[PDB]
Design a binder for these strands. Structure first.
Ligand SMILES: C[C@H](CCC(=O)NCCC[N+](C)(C)C[C@H](O)CS(=O)(=O)O)[C@H]1CC[C@H]2[C@@H]3[C@H](O)C[C@@H]4C[C@H](O)CC[C@]4(C)[C@H]3C[C@H](O)[C@]12C
Ligand SMILES: [Mg+2]
Ligand SMILES: [Mg+2]
Ligand SMILES: [Zn+2]
Ligand SMILES: [Zn+2]
Lengths: 1336, 476, 50
DNA sequence: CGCCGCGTCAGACTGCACACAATCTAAACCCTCCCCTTAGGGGAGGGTCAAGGC
RNA sequence: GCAG
DNA sequence: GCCTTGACCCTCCCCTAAGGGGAGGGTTTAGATTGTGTGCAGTCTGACGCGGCG
C-alpha cells in the first residue's frame, strides 16, 4: 500500500485542505435534543452524519440517495464513520507560535532567527518590539526594542523602519529571511574561525537551514495561522448510562481556543484599546499552547477537577500515549486468563485448557464446524446450541482443538520463553494445567500465578505456534545454550533418592540380569532402591559413521541406577546415571542427550525423567520433620567461647589499649569465626550422620537426612539456609548497612527471641523493598535495550570479513573465571587457529566451533582464538550469520532472518532482577612470564621493572596462561623473568602506601635546580637517625622554584654526565612536591633503589555501562605516543604536553592538579597509556584503543556483574548491544563527499558512501566512530517512528517535522506500529519479496 | 524593569494595566467632554455636506405623516416634547433655504459654517449620525480610490514622479489642462502616459457628477473628510483614555465571578467589552459617576458570557436563569427544612409543575472528563470503560451475509419475473426499492398485476418447499 | 475469563479492558517482543490487526 | 572558556475491586418561530379487492 | 487497596 | 394461467379559529464600588544540556 511515512510541517493551505469546514462556534451539541449544533465542535455538516446514511433533519434517510448533500442542512448522506476521518479548521484571528517549535529545546524559531528564546518570548508576549527591517537606519534586524526605545525612535526615524511585536512580528521575521544566503554566509563564517563550540553552533544552524531548504518547509509555517480540528469521533462527547455525559479534554481546549478567537475578532471589529487586544492575543496564544502541549509554557490549565487537561501532545506521548498504550501493545480478542495448576501427567507439548474457556475462545471455529457438519441450520442456531451447551458441541469442540495450539503467556514476559505454544487438552476444572518442566522457563510457581491464553487464528499462526513456539522446540535457553526445560525440586529429589546407595541396604551384592530384574526385585520388595548390586547393562555408543554399536558388561551399580537406566535413550553412556544425580547432573544428562541424539529423543527423555522422578519421589516419602534439623551439640560451647572472647575484648577496651574502632572490628571478626565454626560443626554433623553397619562393623556414609538430601540434590535450598535452620543465623546488618556487633546466636529450630527477631526484620524488609523497587529498574533497562537493538536482524550468510575479537579465558588475578571453551563454543573462527607447534592448522578458518572442536581445542593447549564477532561484521543494515555464530536455542548456525537484537536485549535484561539495588602470591606451578618487559637489576640481584603497564602472567607447562597480576611501577621482584615457581612463591613485592622514584642508571646524586630552601624543607627525625628532605608542595613555598621545578640528576664521582643506555639525552628525575628525599648529595646508588618516596556494582553498574555514562573521576589517557612535558603548573589546572617522535608535538591538557598523576617526565607513552589512574571512560577507550577494545571492556565489565550473581549470559548478547551503540560516526575530513566536517552521521551511510567513492577512484571521507549509550542511540535512529515511540516524543517529532524526515519502515517497531509483518522471521521472506519487486 | 521575569498572562495584564492612573470625579467629566467634543466636531464637519441635512429634513418629513417617532431621530437639544423640534427643524430649514441660492467665492463660505453651528444644536441618535458619517465616508472613499487609481493609472504606463504630479492634479478637476502640461514635460515616462489618456476620461470626468452632486467640489469635501477623521480620531483616543483608566473596575467586578466556569482572564476580557460599551453609552450630563453606569454594563457582559460559554453543552439564558433560581430556592429550603428538598416540595416552593423541575434538575449536570481516574487509580481512566455501541457484532455480520446467501438461494428458486418483482419490490441487490407503479413501468404493466405477481411469489416462498432455509432466521 | 469477540473501545477500536466488561487480554509490549524474538511474524501481525 | 543554575526527561508487566464531584447568584421587558388546542376535511402516494376478459 |  | 379495470382503502401531511404557551434570542438597567487570592503546594532524584556569567 505504502512504502514509507513522511512527516513535515503543515502549510496553512495544507491545513485548509485537510479540513471539511471551519469551526466557528464552541457549540458542542444541543441540550434538549442532543443533535450536534451547526458550526460547532461537533457538526454534522463539517464532520459528517451522526447516523448511517441519514441527514440530520431526517429529510433523506436511506442509502438510496447516498452522497447527496441535503440542501435543508448541508450534512452529507454517508456512513457515520467519516466522523473519525474528517477534520475541520479554526481560522485564528491573529497568528500564534507553535509551542513545539518555540519551546522544545533547542527552540527551532530561536535556532533559525539566531535569536535567544528569552528575546523571542519577550517579543511575542507583547513586552518588547523587534525591528523586522531597518532600511537606511542604525537598527539592524533582530534588535529588540523595549517600549520607550520604539516610542522615541518612531519620531527620530519616522516610519522608515518597521518594527512589530507579537507572533505577527516573529512570523514577519521568519518570512523575511532568505535561507540560502544565510546558510552560505554561515559557511563563510564557518571557514573563518576555529573556535570549536562556536563552529558547532554554526554547524547546528547550518544543518537546520539546509534541512529547511531540502524539505519543502517554509520557516513561517512554525507560526500557526490556521488550526486543525481533530475529528469528533476521536474526542467524543458520549452519553453515559446515568443520563450524564462524558467528554474528552480536547473539547474543553478547542472550546477555549474558539472562544478566545471569536472574542479577538470582536475586539478587532470594535477597535478596542490596544491593551485589551494585546491581552486577548496573549490569551489566544496561551489557549493554543494549552491545546497543543498543556503545561509546557508555565502552568497547566486544569479543568473542573484541579487536575490538568490532557492536550493533543499528551495523547501521543508517554506510558499512556497512543504509541505505547495502543500501538506497540494492545488488547486482543480470542484470549482468556486463568490460574495455573500443575497437571503432571502431561506431555511436554500440551497444556490443560478448561472446557469452559475453550468453548469461548474457539467460538467461531465451533460455529463453523457446527454448520459444516449439518448440526445447525444457521449460525444463530449454532449460537443457541453452544449457549445451551448441548452434548454435541463438546464433541465438536474436541474436534476443533485437536491439532490447534494455543499460546500461554505469563507476565512479566521477561524473555521469549514467556510465551509458548502448547497443544490443548480439555479438562474439567477452571485452572490451566501447566506441565511442570516448563515452569522454570515461565518463572511460574503455583501459588496464585495466572496465565493468559491466546488462540492462533490463521494457518500461518497455527504453523508458527507449531514450528517456532511449541514447547518441544524451546528446550534450550536463547541466552546461554543450557537446557531451560530442566527438572527441578520434586523430580530432582526423586532421581537423587533413586540413584543413591546405602551401605547394608536390603538385597545387597546380588547379581542381576539387567534393569528389568532390578525393577522386579524392587517392586517385589526383595531389594532396596539403594542396594549396591552387580547388573548386566547393555549400552550403545554412537559409531564414527553415526550408527549405534552395543556393548555389554556387568557394572557395579545400585538397584535404583539400574531402574533408571530403563528410561535412558540409547546413544548415551551408562556412566551418566551411575552416580547420585543432583540438579546439575540431570541438566548435564539432558544436555548430553540433546547434543548426541538431538531434539526428538531429548523430549521423550525429559518427560520420562519427570514421570520417574515424580514417581520415586512419592515412593520415598521424603518428609521434613523437626528432628531433621539436627543442631550440633558443640554449638553451645562454640558460642560460649565466642562470648568469653568478646567479653575479653570488652574488658580490654576498658583498659583503653584498643579504640572503639578496632574493638568493634575484632568483635565482628571473632563472631564471624564463631559463625563459621558453628556452620562447619552443623554441616559435618549433618552430612554424614548416618553411621551404619556392614558385617557388624560400623561405617559412615553420606546422610539420608531429608534436609540434607534436599540441599545436596539441588532440589531446594542451599547450605546457606540449612545454616539458619540448624546452625546459628549469624550477624545481621542495620538498615544503613553497618552490621550489628552481636549476632543472632539462635536459629529457626530454636526460637529467635523478640529482639533478635526485630533485628532480623531490619534486613528482611530491606531485601523485600529492594525486590519491589528494582523490578522497575530492570524493566526500564530491558526496554532501553530492546529499543536500541530492535532493528538488528541476521540479513546475510557471510560478509567475508577477516577481523574478530581475540577470545581468551578471563583470569582475574589468580583464577580463571571463564575458560576458553565457554567463550568460543559456538562462535565462528576468523583465522586458522594452529597448534602451539606452529604451521599445523588445528582448526580451519571459517568453522563453527561446536563441542567437538572445543574438545579438540582443549586436548591441545590453545589459549587464544580469534573469533568472529558482530561488532566486527562488514554487513551494513544487519549482521551476517557467520559473524553472529550459533543459534543458542537450537544449537546450529543461526538462520537468516533472526531478530537477534530482541533476543540479545531480552537475554541481558531478563536476569536483571537477580542483581543488586600488598604483594603477589603465585598459587601453583608454572613458568613466570611478563608483558611490557622493561627490567633492570637492583643492588641485591632482584629484578625491578622500568614500566607502568607491565603485568605478570604465568605460562603453564602446556603453553596456556593460568594467572595474571598487574605490578606497580618499579616493584621489586624476588623471582626474575622466565623462571619456574610453586604454590605460595611470592614474586613481586612493593608497598601501596607510597610510590618510589626508580633509579635510572647507577650513579651519584646531584641537584638540578633543587635549591636548598626554595624547593625543600629539611627535616630531622631520630628513629633512623639521618637527616632528610621533603620536596615542597604548591601553597607552602616562595616565588621562584615553585615555577622552576626541582630535579635530580645522575653524576658520577668524576663530575661527568652519566647517561641512560641507548639514548644520550640528559637523564633527569623531575620531582613533584610532597616527596620524601632521604638520600644525600653524593651517595652511590645502584640502578633499582629508591631515590624518593611519595605517599598516596549491581544493576546500576550495568545501566551506566550500557548508557556509556562517563565516570566521575575518569582515568586520563595518553592521546598520542610521545614524551611527557609540563606547562604552567600551580594554576589550579596544570597543563601537560606530549611530544611525539615524528609527529606534530604540542598537545595540551587541562589536568586538575588535585589528582595524583601516575607517570614521569622522561619516559615515553603511547595511545591508551594511563597518565592518571581511575575508572576508564568508554568514549576514551573507543577513541584511543579502538573498537574492539571498547567491546572487550564492555563485555568484561558487564560479565563481571553477571558472574557474581551466577548468571550465565552469552557474550553475543553484549556484543550485539555494543554494535548498536557503535552506530554513528563523526566526519573529521569531508573528502570528495557530501558530508560536512564535524557532523554526526549514521555509520553505514558513510561506509557505503566511501565504498561508492573508492569504487570510482575518488577519495572518501574519514570518520571517527562514536560511542552513544543505549538511550542516545535509540533516539538517534534513522527512523522517527522508532525514536518517537521509544521516549521523548516531542523532541523526536519536532526535529523530524522541521527536517521533513521520511521513515522507510525498516525495523520492527515501525512495522508493528503500522500493523505490518516484521521484517524478521517468517515475515523476512515477504519483505525481501517487497524489496525485489519495488526496486526493480 | 520587571520585563522578562514572568510568562503568566494575568500577571502581565495586571502589570500593564496598573500603569494608568485612575480618574477623579472631574476627570471623567473632562474626558466625556472631550468625547462629545469629538462627536460634535464630526457633526459640524458633516454639516458641510448639505445632502446630510436634507436627508435629516426629509426624515422629519417622514415623521410628519408618522413614518417614525421623534425619539428615533433626535434624543435632545443643547445650546422630550415635539413642541420645540418643530421650530428646531424650522431653524435648520430656514438656514438651508438661505444657503441654497448662494453660489458666491468668499461670499458662500461663511454660510456653511452658519449651517454647521445651527446644526450643532441637534443631539442626534447614534443611528442617524452613524448613517450620515458612513454615507459621506463611502462617498469620498469611492471617489478617493478613484483618485488613487487615477494616480496608479500612470504606474501601469511608467514609473513616474508624483511630487511633480501632485502639483498638477488639484484644482482644475473638470478638464485635462493639468494633463496637457504632462506632455510639456516629455521625459520618457510621459510618453506612455498619454496613450491611456482616453481610458482615464470616464474616470477623470465621472467624479464631475459629484462635483455638482453634493454642491461642493472634491477638495472642499476633502478637507471636510480630513477634519472628519480628526474629529472621530479625537473622540476615539478620548474613549480609550476612559476605558484604560477604569480597567480595575472590571477586575473588582470580575473577581466576584471567578470559579463559575470561565477563567479569570476570560471574565475580565468580557468585562472589558462591557466597559467599552459603558463608555460609549455614558452621559456625564446626568451628574452621575462613571462607576454607577459602568458597573451595570460590566456585570451584564460578564454574566452573559458565563451564561454563553461556561458550559460544554450550552443551555440558553432562560434555562440558565431557571437553574440559578432553582438552586437559590433549594439552598433556602435546605436551610429551613434542615435537609435537601425533594423535587415535589421544591415544586411548591417554586410555582412550576413538578416534571418541569425534574427535567431542570436533569439538565444542569456537566460532562465528566473521559480522562478522570477511576478511584484515583491514575492507571485506569473513565474513557477506556466506554464501549463503541454503534458497531454490529460479527455474529450479526455473519448472520447478515448468511441471510443474503439464503435469500439468493430462495429467489433463484423462482422464475425470473417473480425474482425481478421481488428484487425490485424490496431493495434486494439494488440501491433502492420501488413502488408497484415503478415496477410496473419497468414491465409496461399496471400496478395490480405486479401486486398479484408479488403476492403469488410470497405464497410460493411461504411453502414448506422453500422456507425451511429462511424460517431459521427468525428467533423463537 | 475467556473472550472470543466482544465489545470494543470507543476512540481506538480495540477490545475493552476487564472481565467485568468481557475483557480481552492485553498483549503488552513485552509479549510483542517475545513474538519478535521467535520469528513469529504472522502470529504477531494477527495480534495487531485482526 | 570553565562553571553553576535551571529546565527537561525518564522512572516493570499482567491482573482483580473500586467507581465522578462535591462552593460559587439577575430582572424586566420585547421579539420571532414552533407546536398546540376542535372534529374532522382534502388530497398525494401507494396498496388492495373482487370482477372480468384474454 | 490487592494478587503474581 | 396473463393481464386489465374500476372501485375501495390505508397512512400521512397539512389545514381549519383565535389565540395559548413556551423556547430561545435580543436590549437595558444612572447613588457609588477602581490590582486574583487557595487559611493552595511547596516535599523526587539523577543525568544531561544549555546558557548566563565571571
Ligand atoms: C461502564 C462502566 C462499567 C465498566 C460503569 C461502571 C462504573 C460506572 C461509573 C461509576 O458508577 C461512577 C460514576 C457514576 C455516574 O453516575 C456516572 C459516571 C461514573 C464514572 C460511572 C460511569 C460508568 O457508568 C461506569 C464506569
Ligand atoms: Mg507465583
Ligand atoms: Mg491502588
Ligand atoms: Zn437535511
Ligand atoms: Zn559478518
Amino acid at each position: 500500500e505504502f512504502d514509507a511515512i513522511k512527516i513535515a510541517l503543515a502549510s496553512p493551505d495544507m491545513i485548509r485542505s485537510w479540513s471539511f469546514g471551519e469551526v466557528k462556534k464552541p457549540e458542542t451539541i444541543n441540550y434538549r435534543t442532543f443533535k450536534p449544533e451547526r458550526d460547532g465542535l461537533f457538526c454534522a455538516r463539517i464532520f459528517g452524519p451522526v447516523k448511517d446514511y441519514e441527514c440530520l433533519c431526517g429529510k433523506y434517510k436511506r442509502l438510496k440517495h447516498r452522497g447527496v448533500i441535503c440542501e435543508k442542512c448541508g450534512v452529507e448522506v454517508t456512513q457515520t464513520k467519516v466522523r473519525r476521518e474528517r477534520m475541520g479548521h479554526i481560522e485564528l484571528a491573529s497568528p500564534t507560535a507553535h509551542i513545539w517549535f518555540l519551546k522544545s529545546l533547542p527552540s527551532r524559531i530561536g535556532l533559525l532567527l539566531d535569536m535567544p528564546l528569552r528575546d523571542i518570548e519577550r517579543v511575542l508576549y507583547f513586552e518588547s518590539y523587534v525591528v523586522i527591517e531597518g532600511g537606511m537606519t542604525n537598527l539592524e534586524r533582530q534588535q529588540i526594542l523595549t517600549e520607550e526605545q520604539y516610542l522615541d525612535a518612531l519620531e527620530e526615524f519616522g516610519d522608515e523602519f518597521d518594527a512589530k511585536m507579537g507572533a505577527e512580528a516573529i512570523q514577519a521575521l521568519l518570512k523575511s529571511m532568505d535561507l540560502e544566503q544565510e546558510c552560505e554566509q554561515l559557511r563563510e563564517e564557518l571557514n573563518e574561525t576555529n573556535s570549536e563550540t562556536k563552529r558547532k553552533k554554526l554547524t547546528k544552524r547550518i544543518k537546520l537551514l539546509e534541512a529547511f531548504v531540502q524539505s519543502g518547509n517554509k520557516p513561517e509555517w512554525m507560526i500557526l495561522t490556521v488550526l486543525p480540528v481533530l475529528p469528533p469521533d476521536l474526542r467524543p462527547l458520549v452519553p453515559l448510562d446515568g443520563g450524564r455525559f462524558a467528554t474528552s479534554d480536547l473539547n474543553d481546549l478547542y472550546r477555549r481556543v474558539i472562544n478566545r478567537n471569536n472574542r479577538l475578532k470582536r475586539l478587532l471589529d470594535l477597535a478596542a484599546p490596544d491593551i485589551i487586544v494585546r491581552n486577548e492575543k496573549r490569551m489566544l496564544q496561551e489557549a493554543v499552547d494549552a491545546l497543543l502541549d498543556n503545561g509546557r509554557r508555565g502552568r497547566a490549565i486544569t479543568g473542573s477537577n484541579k487536575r490538568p487537561l490532557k492536550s493533543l501532545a499528551d495523547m501521543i506521548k508517554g506510558k499512556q500515549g497512543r504509541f505505547r498504550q495502543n500501538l506497540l501493545g494492545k488488547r486482543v480478542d480470542y484470549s482468556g486468563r486463568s490460574v495455573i495448576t500443575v497437571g503432571p501427567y502431561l506431555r511436554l507439548h500440551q497444556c490443560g485448557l478448561p472446557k469452559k474457556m475453550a468453548l469461548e475462545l474457539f467460538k467461531p471455529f465451533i460455529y463453523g464446524k457446527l454448520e459444516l457438519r449439518g448440526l445447525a441450520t444457521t449460525i444463530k442456531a449454532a449460537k443457541k446450541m453452544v449457549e445451551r451447551e448441548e452434548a454435541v458441541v463438546w464433541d465438536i469442540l474436541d474436534e476443533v482443538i485437536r491439532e490447534h495450539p494455543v499460546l500461554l503467556n505469563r507476565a512479566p514476559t521477561l524473555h521469549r520463553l514467556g510465551i509458548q505454544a502448547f497443544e490443548p487438552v480439555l479438562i474439567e476444572g477452571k485452572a490451566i494445567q501447566l506441565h511442570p518442566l516448563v515452569c522454570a522457563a515461565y518463572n511460574a510457581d503455583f501459588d496464585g500465578d495466572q496465565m493468559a491464553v491466546h488462540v492462533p487464528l490463521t494457518l500461518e499462526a497455527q504453523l508458527e505456534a507449531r514450528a517456532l513456539m511449541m514447547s518441544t522446540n524451546n528446550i534450550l535457553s536463547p541466552a546461554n545454550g543450557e537446557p531451560i526445560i530442566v527438572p527441578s525440586q520434586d523430580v530432582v529429589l526423586g532421581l537423587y533418592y533413586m540413584t543413591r546407595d546405602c551401605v547394608n541396604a536390603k538385597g545387597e551384592g546380588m547379581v542381576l540380569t539387567g534393569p528389568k530384574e532390578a525393577e522386579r526385585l524392587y517392586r517385589s520388595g526383595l531389594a532396596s532402591l539403594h542396594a549396591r548390586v552387580k547388573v548386566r547393562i547393555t549400552e550403545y555408543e554412537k559409531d564414527a559413521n553415526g550408527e549405534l554399536v552395543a556393548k555389554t558388561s556387568l557394572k557395579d551399580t545400585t538397584v535404583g541406577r539400574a531402574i533408571l537406566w530403563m528410561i535412558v535413550p540409547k546413544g548415551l553412556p551408562y556412566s551418566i546415571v551411575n552416580q547420585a544425580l543432583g540438579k546439575k547432573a540431570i541438566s548435564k544428562m539432558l544436555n548430553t542427550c540433546y547434543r548426541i541424539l538431538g531434539l526428538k529423543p531429548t523430549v521423550i527423555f525429559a518427560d520420562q525423567i519427570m514421570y520417574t522422578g515424580f514417581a520415586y519421589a512419592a515412593r520415598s516419602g521424603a518428609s521434613v520433620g523437626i528432628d531433621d534439623m539436627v543442631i550440633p551439640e558443640k554449638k553451645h560451647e562454640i558460642i560460649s567461647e565466642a562470648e568469653a572472647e568478646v567479653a575479653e575484648i570488652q574488658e580490654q577496651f576498658q583498659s583503653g589499649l584498643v579504640t572503639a574502632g578496632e574493638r568493634y572490628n575484632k568483635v565482628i571478626d571473632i563472631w564471624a569465626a564463631a559463625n563459621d565454626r558453628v556452620s562447619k560443626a552443623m554441616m559435618d554433623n549433618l552430612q554424614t550422620e548416618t553411621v551404619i553397619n556392614r558385617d557388624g562393623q560400623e561405617e559412615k556414609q553420606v546422610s539420608f537426612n531429608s534436609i540434607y538430601m534436599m540441599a545436596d540434590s539441588g532440589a531446594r535450598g542451599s547450605a546457606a539456609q540449612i545454616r539458619q535452620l540448624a546452625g546459628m543465623r549469624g550477624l545481621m546488618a542495620k538498615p544503613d548497612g553497618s552490621i550489628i556487633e552481636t549476632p543472632i546466636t539462635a536459629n529457626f529450630r530454636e526460637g529467635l527471641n523478640v529482639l533478635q527477631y526485630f533485628i532480623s526484620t531490619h534486613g528482611a524488609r530491606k531485601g523485600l523493598a529492594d525486590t519491589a523497587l528494582k523490578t522497575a529498574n530492570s524493566g526500564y533497562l530491558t526496554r532501553r535495550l530492546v529499543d536500541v537493538a530492535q532493528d538488528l536482524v541476521v540479513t546475510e550468510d557471510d560478509c567475508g570479513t577477516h577481523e574478530g575479537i581475540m577470545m581468551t579465558p578471563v583470569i582475574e588475578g589468580g583464577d580463571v573465571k571463564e575458560p576458553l571453551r565457554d567463550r568460543v563454543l559456538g562462535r565462528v573462527t576468523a583465522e586458522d587457529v594452529l597448534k602451539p607447534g606452529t604451521a599445523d592448522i588445528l582448526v580451519p578458518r571459517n568453522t563453527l566451533l561446536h563441542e567437538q572442536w572445543c574438545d579438540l581445542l582443549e586436548e591441545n593447549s590453545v589459549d587464544a582464538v580469534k573469533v568472529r564477532s558482530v561488532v566486527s561484521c562488514d554487513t551494513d543494515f544487519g549482521v551476517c550469520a557467520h559473524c553472529y555464530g550459533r543459534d543458542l536455542a537450537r544449537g546450529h548456525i543461526i538462520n537468516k532472518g533472526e531478530a537477534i537484537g530482541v533476543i540479545a536485549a531480552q537475554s541481558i535484561g531478563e536476569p536483571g532482577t537477580q542483581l543488586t539495588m600488598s604483594s603477589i602470591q603465585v598459587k601453583n606451578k608454572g613458568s613466570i612470564k611478563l608483558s611490557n618487559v622493561k627490567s633492570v637489576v637492583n643492588s641485591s640481584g632482584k629484578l625491578v621493572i622500568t614500566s607502568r603497564n607491565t603485568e605478570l602472567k604465568l605460562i603453564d607447562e602446556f603453553g596456556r596462561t593460568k594467572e595474571s597480576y598487574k605490578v606497580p611501577y618499579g616493584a621489586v621482584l624476588a623471582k626474575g623473568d622466565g623462571e619456574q615457581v610453586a604454590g605460595g612463591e611470592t614474586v613481586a613485592n612493593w608497598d601501596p602506601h607510597t610510590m618510589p622514584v626508580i633509579t635510572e642508571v647507577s650513579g651519584f646524586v646531584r641537584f638540578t635546580d633543587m635549591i636548598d630552601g626554595q624547593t625543600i624543607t629539611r627535616q630531622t627525625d631520630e628513629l633512623t637517625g639521618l637527616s632528610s628532605l621533603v620536596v615542597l608542595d604548591s601553597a607552602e613555598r616562595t616565588a621562584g622554584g615553585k615555577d622552576l621545578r626541582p630535579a635530580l640528576k645522575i653524576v658520577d664521582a668524576q663530575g661527568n654526565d652519566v647517561l641512560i643506555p641507548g639514548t644520550d639525552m640528559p637523564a633527569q628525575y623531575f620531582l613533584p612536591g610532597k616527596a620524601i628525599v632521604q638520600l644525600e648529595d653524593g651517595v652511590q646508588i645502584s640502578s633499582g633503589d629508591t631515590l624518593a618516596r611519595i605517599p598516596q556494582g549491581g544493576l546500576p553498574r550495568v545501566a551506566d555501562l550500557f548508557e556509556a555514562r562517563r565516570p566521575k573521576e575518569p582515568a586520563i589517557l595518553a592521546e598520542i605516543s610521545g614524551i611527557v612535558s609540563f606547562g604552567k603548573e600551580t594554576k589550579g589546572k596544570r597543563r601537560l604536553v606530549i611530544t611525539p617522535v615524528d609527529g606534530s608535538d604540542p598537545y595540551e591538557e587541562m589536568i586538575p592538579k588535585w589528582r595524583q598523576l601516575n607517570v614521569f617526565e622522561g619516559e615515553r607513552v603511547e595511545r591508551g597509556d594511563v597518565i592518571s589512574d581511575g575508572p576508564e571512560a568508554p568514549h576514551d577507550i573507543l577513541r584511543l584503543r579502538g573498537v574492539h577494545a571498547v567491546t572487550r571492556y564492555i563485555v568484561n565489565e558487564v560479565q563481571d556483574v553477571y558472574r557474581l550473581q551466577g548468571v550465565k549470559i552469552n557474550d553475543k548478547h553484549i556484543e550485539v548491544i555494543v554494535r548498536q551503540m557503535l552506530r554513528k560516526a563523526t566526519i573529521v575530513n569531508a573528502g570528495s563527499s557530501d558530508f560536512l566536517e564535524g557532523e554526526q552521521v549514521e555509520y553505514s551511510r558513510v561506509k557505503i558512501a566511501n565504498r561508492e567513492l573508492e569504487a570510482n577512484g575518488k577519495v572518501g571521507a574519514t570518520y571517527s566512530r562514536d560511542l552513544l549509550g543505549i538511550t542516545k542511540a535509540s533516539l538517534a535512529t534513522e527512523s522517527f517512528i522508532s525514536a518517537a515511540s521509544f521516549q521523548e516524543t516531542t523532541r523526536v517529532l519536532t526535529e523530524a517535522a522541521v527536517a521533513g524526515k521520511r521513515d522507510e519502515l525498516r525495523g520492527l517497531k515501525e512495522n508493528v506500529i503500522v500493523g505490518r509483518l516484521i521484517p524478521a522471521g517468517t515475515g523476512y521472506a515477504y519483505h525481501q519479496d517487497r524489496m525485489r519487486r519495488r526496486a526493480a | 524593569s520587571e520585563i522578562g521575569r514572568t510568562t503568566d498572562p494575568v500577571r502581565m495584564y495586571m502589570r500593564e494595566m496598573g500603569t494608568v492612573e485612575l480618574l477623579t470625579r472631574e476627570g471623567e467629566i473632562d474626558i466625556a467632554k472631550r468625547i462629545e467634543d469629538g462627536i460634535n466636531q464630526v457633526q459640524c464637519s458633516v454639516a458641510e455636506y448639505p445632502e446630510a441635512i436634507t436627508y435629516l429634513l426629509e426624515q422629519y418629513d417622514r415623521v410628519e405623516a408618522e413614518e417614525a417617532r421623534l425619539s428615533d431621530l433626535i434624543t435632545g437639544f443643547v445650546d422630550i416634547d415635539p413642541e420645540l423640534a418643530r421650530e428646531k427643524f424650522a431653524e435648520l430649514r430656514a438656514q438651508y433655504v438661505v444657503t441654497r441660492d448662494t453660489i458666491k467665492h468668499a461670499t458662500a463660505q461663511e454660510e456653511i459654517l452658519k449651517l454647521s453651528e445651527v446644526f450643532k444644536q441637534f443631539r442626534l441618535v447614534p443611528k442617524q449620525f452613524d448613517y450620515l458619517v458612513n454615507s459621506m465616508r463611502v462617498m469620498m472613499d469611492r471617489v478617493r480610490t478613484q483618485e488613487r487609481l487615477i494616480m496608479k493609472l500612470c504606474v501601469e504606463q511608467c514609473k513616474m514622479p508624483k511630487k511633480n504630479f501632485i502639483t498638477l492634479f488639484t484644482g482644475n478637476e473638470t478638464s485635462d489642462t493639468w494633463f496637457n502640461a504632462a506632455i510639456a514635460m516629455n521625459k520618457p515616462w510621459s510618453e506612455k502616459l498619454h496613450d491611456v489618456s482616453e481610458e482615464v476620461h470616464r474616470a477623470l470626468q465621472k467624479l464631475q457628477q459629484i462635483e455638482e452632486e453634493t454642491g461642493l467640489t472634491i477638495e472642499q469635501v476633502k478637507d471636510i473628510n480630513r477634519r472628519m477623521s480628526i474629529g472621530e480620531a479625537k473622540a476615539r483616543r478620548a474613549k480609550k483614555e476612559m476605558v484604560e483608566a477604569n480597567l480595575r473596575l472590571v477586575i473588582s467586578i470580575a473577581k466576584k465571578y471567578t470559579n463559575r466556569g470561565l477563567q479569570f482572564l476570560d471574565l475580565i476580557q468580557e468585562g472589558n467589552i462591557g466597559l467599552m460599551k459603558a463608555v460609549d453609552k455614558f452621559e456625564y450630563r446626568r451628574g452621575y459617576k462613571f462607576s454607577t453606569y459602568a458597573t451595570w454594563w460590566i456585570r451584564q457582559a460578564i454574566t452573559r458570557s458565563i451564561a454563553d460559554q461556561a458550559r460544554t453543552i450550552r443551555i440558553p439564558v432562560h434555562m440558565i436563569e431557571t437553574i440559578n433560581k432553582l438552586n437559590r430556592i433549594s439552598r433556602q429550603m435546605l436551610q429551613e427544612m434542615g435537609r435537601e428538598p425533594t423535587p415535589e416540595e421544591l415544586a411548591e416552593r417554586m410555582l412550576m409543575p413538578e416534571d418541569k423541575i425534574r427535567k431542570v434538575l436533569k439538565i444542569a449536570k456537566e460532562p465528566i472528563s473521559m480522562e478522570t481516574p477511576i478511584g484515583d487509580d491514575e492507571d485506569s481512566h473513565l474513557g477506556d470503560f466506554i464501549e463503541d455501541t454503534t458497531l454490529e457484532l460479527p455474529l450479526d455480520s455473519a448472520t447478515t451475509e448468511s441471510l443474503r446467501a439464503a435469500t439468493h438461494d430462495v429467489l433463484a428458486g423462482l422464475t425470473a419475473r417473480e425474482a425481478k418483482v421481488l428484487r425490485m419490490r424490496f431493495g434486494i441487490d439494488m440501491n433502492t426499492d420501488y413502488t408497484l407503479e415503478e415496477v410496473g413501468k419497468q414491465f409496461d404493466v399496471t400496478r395490480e398485476r405486479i401486486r398479484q405477481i408479488e403476492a403469488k411469489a410470497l405464497r410460493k416462498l411461504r411453502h414448506p418447499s422453500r422456507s425451511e432455509v429462511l424460517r431459521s432466521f427468525l428467533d423463537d | 475469563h475467556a473472550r472470543s469477540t466482544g465489545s470494543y473501545s470507543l476512540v481506538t477500536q480495540q477490545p475493552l479492558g476487564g472481565k467485568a466488561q468481557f475483557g480481552g487480554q492485553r498483549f503488552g509490549e513485552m509479549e510483542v517482543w517475545a513474538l519478535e524474538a521467535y520469528g513469529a511474524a504472522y502470529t504477531l501481525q494477527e495480534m495487531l490487526t485482526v
